[PDB]
Structure of A612L protein:
Amino acid sequence: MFNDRVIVKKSPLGGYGVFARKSFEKGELVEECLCIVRHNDDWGTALEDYLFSRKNMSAMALGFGAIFNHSKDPNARHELTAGLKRMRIFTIKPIAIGEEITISYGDDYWLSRPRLTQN
Amino acid sequence: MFNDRVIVKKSPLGGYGVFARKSFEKGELVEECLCIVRHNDDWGTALEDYLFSRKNMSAMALGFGAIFNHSKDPNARHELTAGLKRMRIFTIKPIAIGEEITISYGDDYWLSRPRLTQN
């Protein structure tokens, strides 16, 4: 997987990650993708590590949206339109070619609140 | 969403679809994407219309993989590596620019067998 700016590859550390295939300027657009949105309880635990939520809805980002890894020192941020229909990834720092593009452990990510029960 | 060959847009008929942004030859590569794979019962009903399954595993295609619509007269086919880790979409007919790229209602798609119960 790869487009005219990012490339997905196995991270020497964790699993897969999104890496810059070209130099990036601060505040530039990295990726905008559509999301599948359904009520929180419609999702099992399968995507618990990828879903984000707002109110009673959770969304799964398509495109490369769900591949971006979370970092304690992110060089990007994510933005969801109303209704979680669209996700946008914007850099918050310049990004050199080859650097992994990461987002923070946002509060809207299921991952920030593991659950003892689910499905 | 769009790359150096396909573009996602609202279909005048159904919802969203993947359309050729360039002419395509028969048997050519349209898209290869990574998939998230988990046991069948780990998925709720949220993605029931997008998941495919093999044995006791189901997979959600990332990239544009889950956006391709199903047609009774498809101009493409899908292929999953072992373990459903990767999906590949190959044309089975030449495809002109602007034509929607569709796959058949494969037996491996959850959609071919709606369920009365789930999660």
In short: The longest strand of chain B covers residues 29-39. The two ends of chain B are 30 Å apart (CA to CA). Chain B has one domain: 1-102. DSSP finds no helices and nine strands in chain B.
